Amino acid sequence: VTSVAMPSYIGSSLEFTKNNLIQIVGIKEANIEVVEVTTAPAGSVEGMVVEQSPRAGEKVDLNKTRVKISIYKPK
């Protein structure tokens, strides 16, 4: 079975998170969706990962899972 635990990316930059998934975890670029969210916990920095699917430590299948990364982009 080619399923690993999802790293915790909350608080990291999008660039780090995307390239970690691709180069270290082995997720295909096609299976990463980036969404911008307008709200985030207090202290969040614009551009930072504030939510992720799968959640930290949950199963991610290297070929099946559609990874979703939410980035804080306030108005």
Write down how long the chain is: 75
- Cα 64 vs. chain centroid, distance in angstroms? 15
Do β-strands 49-53 and 67-72 pair in parallel, antiparallel, or remain unpaired?
Answer: antiparallel
Which one, of 16, 5, 10, 2, lies nearest residue 58 by Cα? 5
The answer to whether residues 6 and 61 touch, using CB atoms and an 8 Å cutoff, is no
Domain spans in the chain, listed from the N-terminal domain onward = 1-75
Structure tokens at 55: 């959640």
Which one, of 45, 47, 52, 51, lies nearest residue 66 by Cα? 52
Which one, of 14, 50, 55, 57, lies nearest residue 67 by Cα? 55
**Elucidated via:** X-ray
Q: What letter represents residue 65's amino acid?
A: T
The answer to whether residues 54 and 60 touch, using CB atoms and an 8 Å cutoff, is yes
Q: What is the resolution of this structure in A?
A: 1.9
